[PDB]
Design a protein around this ligand. Structure first.
Ligand SMILES: COc1c(O)ccc2c1cc([N+](=O)[O-])c1c(C(=O)O)cc3c(c12)OCO3
Length: 121
């Protein structure tokens, strides 16, 4: 759920998931349209694609557990859904920190209306 994902984000980036990544660009948030604004936005686009490929699960609401070994996130082996959701979240949180050097304040609170057109995964 957003609880676990938000925790990963804070641990990896040092930024509170909300509002740093909840209204960023075209894909970091509820929205999902247009061309990703930058690397960080692409992390969210990919994250959406990952969630979109878990039709048999409830990514935003399903709770799961994970731990950290040797400084890296390790998804606990729970149900198939919990494991997959965890992996989608892990990849995104890491993607966020790997791209913090191009994170731009101007894309925060980005207006959804500026994002149009479906972009295939
Ligand atoms: C399905 O999509 C999304 C992504 O691809 C990437 C990130 C988020 C996302 C959807 C969220 N909501 O809203 O859907 C959400 C939320 C929220 O619930 O408040 C809070 C956050 C997020 C996201 O990142 C940091 O803090």
């Amino acid at each position: 759920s957003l609880l676990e994902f938000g925790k990963m984000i804070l641990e990896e980036t040092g930024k509170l998931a909300i509002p740093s990544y909840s209204s960023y660009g075209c894909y970091c948030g509820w929205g999902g349209k247009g061309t990703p604004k930058d690397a960080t936005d692409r992390c969210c686009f990919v994250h959406d694609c990952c969630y979109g490929n878990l039709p048999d699960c409830n990514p935003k609401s399903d709770r799961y557990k994970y731990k950290r070994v040797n400084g890296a996130i390790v998804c606990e082996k729970g149900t198939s859904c919990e494991n997959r959701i965890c992996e989608c979240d892990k990849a995104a949180a890491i993607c966020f920190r790997q791209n913090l050097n191009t994170y731009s304040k101007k894309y925060m609170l980005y207006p959804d209306f500026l994002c149009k057109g479906e972009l295939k995964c």
